[PDB]
Design a protein around this ligand. Sequence first.
Ligand SMILES: [Zn+2]
Lengths: 422, 123, 160
Amino acid sequence: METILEQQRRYHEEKERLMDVMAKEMLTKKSTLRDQINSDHRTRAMQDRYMEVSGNLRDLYDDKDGLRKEELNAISGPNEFAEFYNRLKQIKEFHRKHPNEICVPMSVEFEELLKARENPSEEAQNLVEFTDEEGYGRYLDLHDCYLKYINLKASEKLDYITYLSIFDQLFDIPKERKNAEYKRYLEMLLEYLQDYTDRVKPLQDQNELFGKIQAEFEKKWENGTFPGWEERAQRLFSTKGKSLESLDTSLFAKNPKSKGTKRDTERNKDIAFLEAQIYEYVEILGEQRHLTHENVQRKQARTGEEREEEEEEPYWLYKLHGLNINYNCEICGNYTYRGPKAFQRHFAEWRHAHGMRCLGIPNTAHFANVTQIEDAVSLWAKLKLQKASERWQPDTEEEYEDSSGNVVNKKTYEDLKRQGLL
Amino acid sequence: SAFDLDVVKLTAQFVARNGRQFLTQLMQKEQRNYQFDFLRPQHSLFNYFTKLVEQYTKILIPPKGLFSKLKKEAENPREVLDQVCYRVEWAKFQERERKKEEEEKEKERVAYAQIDWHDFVVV
Amino acid sequence: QDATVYVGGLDEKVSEPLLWELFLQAGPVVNTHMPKDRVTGQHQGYGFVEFLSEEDADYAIKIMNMIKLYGKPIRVNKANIFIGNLDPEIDEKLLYDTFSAFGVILQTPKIMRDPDTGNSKGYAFINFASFDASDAAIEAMNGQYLCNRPITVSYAFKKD
Ligand SMILES: [Zn+2]
């Protein structure tokens, strides 16, 4: 197999087709947010497929460095080419043209008029990744988080506006203790906010953003990211102040700070990372949180009907010529025909021939004035028997006397004679 | 049409490894009693065979995957998005140039259908 | 329709038994049909020959194609620019190849057909890429010698 010649060119053609499909998707205008989110998800899937194809093609270079000495040699050539042509010299009886060598990846990376989705992305749906209250990235669902916060706080003195004001803080004082059970709800709220940020922009590099967030949490947040003018340096895990930078560096490797506490850097590192991720998601998606707060305020200020509307978004010839007397035929869909002059003519017309073909019986003068099915099939059996009888069938009707005994056995049919003479 | 396409792909793979324009693995095969009608430029399949030979020559580039590894197209979606935006801008510029050429052709047709064809002067 | 062959380009010398006698050497032509006009009461140049087998109709279409019968381009077939008095022996691909010498064609051309026979009506419509190809067709092709039929190219719509 030509893995360096044919497979690399096929991977390059697939990458060029994916880039052309991405350019055609980016050049087309958008009219709705859900269709734009679906197009962005399809472009992200096509970019992931192109990255996988490039990673598969980039690993096919180990044998190429060994085969380049034999491929670039001018002493070789038409011997192996003539051997491959003799291998390609098989029977050409498969008379079938295949124009889908390059047209099939072009049609697989395209959409239809009824549904604007690609062929690998035909099973993708925007309702399986986002809820109806989010609006495909327009707002964020915070009713379940507010219910969980009200269940954890064990008090009914916190509304949705108070929860939105408590969630709007980034570096202020927290509402509850850092070593309490609110961190288990904050980690779930951060894991939901990370999925909401990854769903609001599928075309952005999530792995590079996660690596940048991890680098900012390790190199900056773990080394005093909030300087002061106890107020000079504050620790997120130990929740205590520091006199100077040397005292904080000496206390960073201390025994209560490493593992000798309940909020040290060994056990409470994941909660601090989740809090940093929640702060980064609140700083990156503050406009979506403000839009969700404005939508919640508009839903609270509205009435019941406004909220329902927001959630819903020659009579003599008649009897002289034969009319008023109707006849029906089962062979013709129980089609009821009018006066006899038309009824007698219908057997020759198209509809009756069609109805008769359904059973497989030809239209002849024998099957006239016959309107029922079973009568037709019985008369067809009769006519078949009659005609088949009255013909001359030489196969069963013939008297051969084979030369096996040559003076006996004249009861041989026309088939046993061939079997004896074979 | 699979056998002819396979023969054209084999000819494009054997002709791309040549060290000269006329000293290839297909010019000597024509004198070796092997019938190959796709080598002549008069056939319509020669335009596809030239594109296949160009793709085989572009598959032998040093950034094509022989002695180097691509990092921008394989490990950066933002570079691919910028390349797609540049391709869309180039397609929009080509469409604008085609519209300007069509407008110039319409202006030339309007000017040619309004000139006087009776003022003949033979010098 | 498969066993019948539609003949186009018949003059006044050709008749209904004459086409069956001329098509008798190609195959067993069972019947001949000639639609009469309403204003003149004669044949419009297009007729049909219903044979017994489809192979005889194929041989008559491959043998009597673009023939000069009664001083007319008779041809048998399987039953903004305007071109008139065109020969029925040419097809859409043949008209596209003949129109490719003057200018570039935007798409595949279409030829008008009769509602009864459906082989050839007599007029066709073709669209060019620009007005220069239309002017070259009105200068050169409007009056060129086609296959035994003087065609006439004209503009379909023009604004003064
Ligand atoms: Zn009936």
